[PDB]
Design a protein around this ligand. Sequence first.
Ligand code: UDP
Ligand code: UDP
Ligand code: UDP
Ligand code: UDP
Ligand code: NDG
Ligand code: NDG
Ligand code: NDG
Ligand code: NDG
Lengths: 377, 377, 377, 377
Amino acid sequence: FQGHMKIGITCYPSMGGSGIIATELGIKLAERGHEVHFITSNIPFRIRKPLPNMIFHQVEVNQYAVFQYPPYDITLSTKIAEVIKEYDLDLLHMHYAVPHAICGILAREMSGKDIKIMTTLHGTDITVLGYDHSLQGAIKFGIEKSDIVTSVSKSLAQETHEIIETNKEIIPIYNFVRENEFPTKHNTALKSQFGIAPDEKVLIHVSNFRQVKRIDTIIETFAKVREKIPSKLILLGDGPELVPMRQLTKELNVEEDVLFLGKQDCVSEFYQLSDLVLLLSEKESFGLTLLEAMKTGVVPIGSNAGGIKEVIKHGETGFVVDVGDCDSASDYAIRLLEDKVLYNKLQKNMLADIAERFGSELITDQYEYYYQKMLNE
Amino acid sequence: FQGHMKIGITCYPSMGGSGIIATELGIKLAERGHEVHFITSNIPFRIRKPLPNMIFHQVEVNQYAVFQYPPYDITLSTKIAEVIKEYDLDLLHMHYAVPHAICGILAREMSGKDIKIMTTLHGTDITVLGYDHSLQGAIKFGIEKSDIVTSVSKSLAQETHEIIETNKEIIPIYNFVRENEFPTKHNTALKSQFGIAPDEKVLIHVSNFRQVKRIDTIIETFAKVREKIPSKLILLGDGPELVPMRQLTKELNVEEDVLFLGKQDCVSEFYQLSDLVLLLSEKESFGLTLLEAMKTGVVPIGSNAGGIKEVIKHGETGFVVDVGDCDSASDYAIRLLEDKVLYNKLQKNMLADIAERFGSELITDQYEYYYQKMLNE
Amino acid sequence: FQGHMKIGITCYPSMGGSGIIATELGIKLAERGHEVHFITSNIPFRIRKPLPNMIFHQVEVNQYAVFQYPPYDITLSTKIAEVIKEYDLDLLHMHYAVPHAICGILAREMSGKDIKIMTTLHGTDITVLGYDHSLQGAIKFGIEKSDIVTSVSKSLAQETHEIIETNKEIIPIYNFVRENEFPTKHNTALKSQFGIAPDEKVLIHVSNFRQVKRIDTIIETFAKVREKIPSKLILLGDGPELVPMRQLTKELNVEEDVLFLGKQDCVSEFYQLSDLVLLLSEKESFGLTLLEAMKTGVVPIGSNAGGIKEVIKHGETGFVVDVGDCDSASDYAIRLLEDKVLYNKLQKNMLADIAERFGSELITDQYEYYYQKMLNE
Amino acid sequence: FQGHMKIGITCYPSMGGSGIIATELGIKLAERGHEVHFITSNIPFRIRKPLPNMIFHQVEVNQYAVFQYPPYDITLSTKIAEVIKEYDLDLLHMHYAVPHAICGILAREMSGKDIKIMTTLHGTDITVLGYDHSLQGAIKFGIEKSDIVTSVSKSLAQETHEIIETNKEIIPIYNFVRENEFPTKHNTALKSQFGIAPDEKVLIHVSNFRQVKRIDTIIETFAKVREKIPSKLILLGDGPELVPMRQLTKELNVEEDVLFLGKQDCVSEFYQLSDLVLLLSEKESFGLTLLEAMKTGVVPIGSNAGGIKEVIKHGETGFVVDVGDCDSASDYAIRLLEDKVLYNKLQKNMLADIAERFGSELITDQYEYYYQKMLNE
Ligand SMILES: O=c1ccn([C@@H]2O[C@H](COP(=O)(O)OP(=O)(O)O)[C@@H](O)[C@H]2O)c(=O)[nH]1
Ligand SMILES: O=c1ccn([C@@H]2O[C@H](COP(=O)(O)OP(=O)(O)O)[C@@H](O)[C@H]2O)c(=O)[nH]1
Ligand SMILES: O=c1ccn([C@@H]2O[C@H](COP(=O)(O)OP(=O)(O)O)[C@@H](O)[C@H]2O)c(=O)[nH]1
Ligand SMILES: O=c1ccn([C@@H]2O[C@H](COP(=O)(O)OP(=O)(O)O)[C@@H](O)[C@H]2O)c(=O)[nH]1
Ligand SMILES: CC(=O)N[C@@H]1[C@@H](O)[C@H](O)[C@@H](CO)O[C@@H]1O
Ligand SMILES: CC(=O)N[C@@H]1[C@@H](O)[C@H](O)[C@@H](CO)O[C@@H]1O
Ligand SMILES: CC(=O)N[C@@H]1[C@@H](O)[C@H](O)[C@@H](CO)O[C@@H]1O
Ligand SMILES: CC(=O)N[C@@H]1[C@@H](O)[C@H](O)[C@@H](CO)O[C@@H]1O
């Protein structure tokens, strides 16, 4: 270890798992005593306590009458460059090849200092290219001009090499949750408040309600489970598929047993009253909602898309089914909700496995290691 | 006919066929003596000559430090409402259910006058819903609160009823080209300038280079044609697939015979040197580039997506193939480039057919008819 | 009182005082048992605990390849309309004439129900019109078609009548802070962490660093205070003037005594170690940072812009100076930092005055009263 | 001269004088035989004829569900970099320090080739900094990392050195009009169409209707002229001040003599029927509308803001008044509309002066000269 580092972090602090990961990583590094600078647009964050060595820099992105589009990329690069000059930063940690790796590359030019840049891929660069190949060259450049590139799963590293066609080494470093924010415990005080009887089994799904999440499979799965087991499906979040999914609960005549609770700041309290977590996505590079529930003690059922099959060990820590397979998913779910022996076995394997592979201290050490490798090249 | 009308038109004047259609329709109505007001954002237009009775109102969409996003919808509605009050408009003709039908509905509220609203669907509302169902309710509302709804093909009207689930009557009114802008003629003066020998056959495709256009099928088709016939493929336009398509011409070793000419203001001069026009799209509600080429005398080969199979009469005015079928497309193309008798026969049927179904005077009469029907309800 | 209400609230949850006010008002109403629905774009919020009767609906604003600008206004109106239909809302509370009053007016149309709409003005509609009169008609319409319009100060109500020229009644209802989030207490544990000696006086300013905040006057004021009194100026926040203001501290040779701490989630802990709060803005309709500091026990010095001179009672609860008058501001500040008798007197008047005029229970009662007045008209 | 150059040009083709200048410069260079590539966003342009050596590359700027803002800067830089690689460009000519100089600087990095970059300042970088200092560092960097920087007037070069504080040399190169697009002639055929009697004097103003244009001074000036001389004021364009200015014509009771004609594609035909052109702006780095009218034969009255007093030679080719001075402006205007001897004298000096200083061939030669100087450094 070469020691204390001055670190600039850029992400979208309010978008999905990537914003949580980048913020919590920054907090962990700050608690060890690194000097951590966040540089994001005018978007809020979740920071429990102020630390003298952790600063949130925020830039306002305004169109004037001069620009055709609000100049996010240039405004953010300028701000990062100003933080580099003012605080003599050692390195940048950018989340996403676009826009943020390019923003860091531009900021290094604007700052005059040859700062090192780590870029972490979360899968959004693959998503973008599924709609539109305009940014293919930018994604490739942001990957190849970063000093080190990481990915939140091995599946994502392989898919990136396929789709972007680069020989750049991509280092898989998994996601983590902060153990103190997700106590392994089970509560029922909140269960009554939301109209769930103590003898009802609770299935939970937490997402942005995009089509890629296949909440249609989740609701189809729940309807089959509901036939055999009195239960509730809790859906946390909001997004594009909200209304189609609400109508699907009426077609399957399960409307009174599906609770659309909206967006929640404190998801751990809802995991604590849950029995099963579902993530049946078509594409998923990691699936932070699974690890959050698993850390709480909730056993997972996932699809075999992307990194979900790295998070869940099929048959040991939970179950993995094919994308779209509501028959198998409801079979596994009914078993787990009937069979305390299976549930307790997977749950105890799961709590041990996530501590060995996804511990916040272990993962921070991995990131910190590659920070110093960058600085010594 | 009840006579002279005061008409407000809103479109995106620079986006694809819809902007051309809405602008040329407005010009035709202005030439008959209607008072025509365009109300669009700060985007240029193509207007040949000023008319005292045709005014272009343009609104600037600025973010300040106050809005999170540039308030296009509200700014435009406000501007339309101001034009309604100042000039006592009789009706609005909005292009797209979103945003523009909603903008007209809001502007009618803001103006205080019960103006009538026609909305023309171009298919972009189906495109939007393929990505994201957030706007499903807005699209349905914009359709159902318009006084009359039209669509640029019968295929689009049926697909709308399927996907939006409304009993609203949708009136098919086809697209047109301005006959004087597309003379039926064949030139070769420009052919040499662009490095095309007089004995070379020319295939032309004109689009926005989005994936839905299947320019991969077009280039695969050309490579098969190139085996038997010395020829050039001219690709007009630019967009997301430019670089992947350029690389595909190197894989098929046809790179020197594919001309990527970029965006062109004056496409008729390129149709005039062309022998075949191709539009092999996966989704296409009309296909204005086909009618433009056909009016020039160029025989078309299209896919059977959407309205293309209404524009081309398969076997009579051109050929229609299955989406992706480069084998059949190259068969038809080689025939047409070898066989003057087939070419001349389809060409003469085509010039007669487009005059009977897509004449600018006929189509303007159809729109003008439904304007007056709205005003008399 | 007519009782329980189903309420939809729309604001920008992450922009300045307006987002805090609208969120905390919603929380207070939810704690009394009203059914409270927030409907905002994909922007985070600060909600301490989940309540079964408080739902956060969040809409994703995406450009496709179809829109020129991300359709915030229409997307949000659609979402509000869906919440109206699904939960049979009684009323909407929109913050800002633009965009949100217009969004609520459009959503009422889209929902089919004649819901009542309250709109609260925060001054941003005056700001917008200082740059650009495009939205003048929209602001006037949003005010005049709301069922009730409020303003966060009397100054703002008068300035609105001047600049928008409407006979609409605007009801002044002041801002508030949540008393439990801002305990009246003084800590020094955090003071050492940030390198402030126990015998140093602390001046604090909290803002978005826009030019209208006149942080140049604040820093000029501090430099004069620093001549007579060992002290630190803490600047919380970030924004456009950060770099010019940092350079101004070098010109005045006070750089080591000005602490640029960045954006902070938990400002109350910094107010708790502060002795004076400064808000010397050119335009300020209320000034939520003053009330937050005052509730903590910190005595204020403000300009006489807008509502600041309604929040501070000059000579009784703090001091008010002319915009730009760093001479007077430093005079008042040196006095307050030398004179415990003056400080304690103003502080005790201030704590009593803010409880009588700005108490969260009192203000919520005022809003709740006008909600029911709307419903009974 | 070192000869033929491969040139990439980036501007906003639809925004004011800068878009006209950059496009016409590119056309002039293409007519001499340079290989000219335009690279802009999905915004139309005005190109009279296709040239094999002039290509318009256009990039689509889409938000997905992944970006918070449409990534204009990165999308455009990527596209420029692709054109650099594909066509082996020698140099970039970027218009505006932000965003376009930064875009070219980023594209040079992305391309791998050390291309030279000229940046032309038009004054928008000063405008931006009047609202908001966030981009100060970006503007300075874009200026200092360009190989050559030009400005459209000497006033703008001096104001830039004041406000940005750089020792970078800025080369003044004036704007021009294309002589063939603005024939020196006077028509009256169009005058009747727009309801102007043959014996009426015509004053014309052409702008974007922003506040900086002081159309209030122009209308106040016209009202004084109207007292002594039967005349019409033609206002071409549209924008934020349209409605306030229309109301000002009612207060001054000149409403029937002010013609709000909207946006016009073909302004030369309106200059041809005009007697006086007015540009009384508070800030104006050149004023392309003046040169267009002057080339048509119309004598100008301007303010002394920025470059207007370089375009107009006060007393020799027209008159210059203080910003806001409607008394002097109406004095000069009444004289010029009464006095054929003065009018003819200034008109003949003006036509000679604009040919010596602002000829399209001369200005293109100046740009071409500095292109080659860049390439030889
Ligand atoms: O109402 C919600 C919905 C989601 N999330 C968080 O958003 C993140 C989503 O991460 P994941 O990887 O599961 O999905 P992504 O959104 O990245 O696809 C998780 O931390 C969730 O806890 C949340 O805090 N509240
Ligand atoms: O370089 C170009 C490319 C396209 N177009 C025009 O854009 C329109 C495209 O219409 P179409 O219906 O073919 O496709 P869309 O873009 O609407 O999908 C046609 O009028 C084309 O002539 C053009 O003028 N220049
Ligand atoms: O780092 C910061 C800076 C500001 N604020 C909050 O932002 C709001 C600003 O409100 P105010 O009325 O003072 O100013 P505005 O931003 O509305 O002009 C206050 O609640 C501040 O506590 C904050 O929480 N953290
Ligand atoms: O209806 C209009 C209004 C303006 N313009 C053109 O927009 C440009 C404006 O340039 P100028 O330098 O006068 O003003 P700017 O907009 O750059 O401030 C001139 O070429 C005008 O001819 C136009 O073509 N049509
Ligand atoms: C659909 C998808 O791939 N989303 C991923 C998610 O799997 C991952 O947990 C998150 C944090 O790394 O980044 C992305 O949002
Ligand atoms: C892919 C698609 O459906 N585009 C259509 C196009 O077919 C049609 O010609 C144009 C004008 O009506 O509108 C849309 O852009
Ligand atoms: C500069 C200005 O007027 N900002 C006001 C602020 O005074 C007020 O406290 C806040 C909440 O009502 O709304 C606005 O942001
Ligand atoms: C207000 C202002 O400075 N606008 C200038 C204009 O003077 C100039 O003619 C144009 C072209 O160089 O660029 C800018 O738009």
